[PDB]
C-alpha cells in the first residue's frame, strides 16, 4: 500500500497547494497574464502572414501524434472543407519489386472508385474524421452513427450488446481522451470473392463507465480509469452510395477492440 498511500499524500499536498491562498492567487495572476498575452498577440494572429506561417509549421499534420477532435469541431471542420476545400537474378528480384501484389490490387480498386484516394489521403481522413467519429459513438452507445458505418455483421453484434445493457437499465457514457496510431495496417482481399478491404488500427485512450438509467450512479468501470485500448477496423467502400454525405461509401466490415491496458 506504499504506492497508494504515497499517492494520496501527493494528491492531497497538491490539492492543499492548489487550494492554498498563495497558490490560487498565483495561478489566477498567471492565468490573467495569459489572457492578456493572447489578447496582445491577437491582432498578429489576424494577419495573413500568421495564417500562412502557422499553416507551414503545423499544417494540421500534428494530428498524427495524438489528440481527440471534439464532435462539434469535427463536424464544423468537415463541412468547412466540403464547402471549399474538399468540394541476372538480382534484376529478376528487382522486377518482382515492381510487380502487382494483393496490396496493390486493393489500393488500385479504391483509386478507381475515388481518383483522389491514397494511403496518405485516407489515413488523414480516417485520423481526422472517420476513426474519432466511430470510436466516440462506440464508447457512448450511439447506435445512430454506428448504423451508417458498421455493416450488418458488426452492428448486429453491437446492437445485441446494447440490448443486454438495456435489460439491466444501464447506459454507456464513456469518453475518448486521445486517439493515436491511426494507420492503414494492411490492405487485403477478402477471399474467395477478392473484396478489397483496408485493415485500420489505432490506439485510443478512453474512460469506460456505465451509469444506471434511472438514478445515474456508477454501474461499471470508474469515472477516472483511463484505458489504452487498441482497435482493429476492416474498411471497404461500396461503389453505390459513394455519394453518401456522412460515410461516402466507406463501411466497416469488422470492428475488434483489444489490447486494453491502463494509462495516464
Amino acid at each position, epitope marked *: 500500500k506504499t504506492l497508494k498511500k504515497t499517492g494520496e499524500t501527493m494528491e492531497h499536498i497538491a490539492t492543499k497547494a492548489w487550494e492554498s491562498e498563495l497558490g490560487k492567487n498565483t495561478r489566477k495572476a498567471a492565468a490573467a497574464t495569459a489572457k492578456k498575452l493572447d489578447e496582445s498577440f491577437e491582432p498578429v494572429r489576424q494577419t495573413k502572414i500568421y495564417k500562412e506561417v502557422s499553416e507551414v509549421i503545423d499544417d494540421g499534420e500534428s494530428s498524427r501524434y495524438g489528440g481527440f477532435i471534439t464532435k462539434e469541431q469535427r463536424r464544423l471542420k468537415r463541412e468547412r472543407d466540403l464547402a471549399s476545400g474538399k468540394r541476372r537474378k538480382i534484376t529478376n528480384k528487382v522486377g518482382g519489386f515492381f510487380a*502487382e501484389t494483393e496490396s496493390s490490387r486493393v489500393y488500385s480498386q479504391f483509386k478507381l472508385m475515388d481518383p483522389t484516394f491514397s494511403n496518405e489521403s485516407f489515413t488523414r481522413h480516417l485520423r481526422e474524421y472517420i476513426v474519432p467519429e466511430i470510436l466516440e459513438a462506440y464508447v457512448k452507445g450511439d447506435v445512430k452513427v454506428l448504423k451508417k458505418w458498421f455493416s450488418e455483421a458488426p452492428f448486429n453484434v453491437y446492437a445485441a450488446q446494447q440490448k443486454i445493457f438495456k435489460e439491466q437499465d444501464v447506459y454507456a457514457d464513456g469518453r475518448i481522451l486521445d486517439i493515436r496510431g491511426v494507420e492503414i495496417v494492411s490492405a487485403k482481399l477478402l477471399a*474467395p*470473392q*477478392d473484396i*478489397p478491404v483496408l485493415v485500420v488500427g489505432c490506439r485510443a485512450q478512453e474512460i469506460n463507465l456505465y451509469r444506471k438509467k434511472k438514478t445515474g450512479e456508477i454501474a461499471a468501470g470508474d469515472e477516472a480509469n483511463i484505458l489504452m485500448s487498441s482497435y482493429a477496423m476492416v474498411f471497404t467502400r461500396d*461503389p*453505390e452510395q459513394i455519394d453518401d454525405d456522412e460515410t461516402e461509401g466507406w463501411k466497416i466490415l469488422e470492428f475488434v477492440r483489444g489490447g486494453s491496458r491502463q494509462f495516464t
Partner: antibody
Amino acid sequence: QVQLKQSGPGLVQPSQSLSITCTVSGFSLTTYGVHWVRQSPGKGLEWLGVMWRGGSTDFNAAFMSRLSITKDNSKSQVFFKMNSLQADDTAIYYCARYGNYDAMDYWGQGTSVTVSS
Amino acid sequence: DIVLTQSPASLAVSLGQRATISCRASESVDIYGISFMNWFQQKPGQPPKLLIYATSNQGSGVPARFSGSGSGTDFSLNIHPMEEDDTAMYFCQQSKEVPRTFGGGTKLEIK
C-alpha cells in the same frame, strides 16, 4: 498486357480424358486466380472449377468427381483435366482470370472440344 | 446453386435507343451489402467479355453506355445509346457462392 492462352485437344474420344493447359502471361498465379468455365450450345455457360488466388481448388458439384485443376506458379500454367467425357461434354472450355469482386476480367480464347468417333 | 433467370430471352431494338436486359437471382447475391452480379457480353466467335462487375462497376475499358443496376435479387443491364456494334449475347453471373452460375443469355439485335 494480360493474356491467357490455352493448349488442349479437340476431338476427344468418348470415355477418355480432356486436358487443357492455360499458359498465362502478364500476371502471376500467386496474385491472381483462374476460373474454368464451359459453354455448351444446348446448356449455355457453366462453371467447372477454379484455382483460387491462394492456390486451392474448388469444383462444381456435378463435376467434382471428374475435374482436377492444378497449377504451376513458376511456368505460369494452370492445368485442367476431366477423367471421363461423354457426348454431353462437347463444348468450348475457357480459363478466365478473376480479379476484384470475382470479376472474370480476362478470358482464354477457348478450346473447342468434341466428344465423338 | 443460385438460379439466375434472365429475361427477355431475345431482344430487338433500333440504334440509339435504350435496351434493357434483366436478371432475377433465385437468392440474394449480397455479401457485405455488395451484390456480386457480373454482366458479360459474347460475340459469336469470341470468349465472353466482362462488362459490369459488382452490379455497377464498368469493366476495364468498357464503354460508358453499359449501365448495371439492381440489388437484392433483381438486376438490370442498360445499353444506351445502343450502337450497331454491341449486338451480342449478354449473361448475368453471380459471384456470391460456389458454384458460380450464369444466366440463360439474352440475344440482343438490331431492328
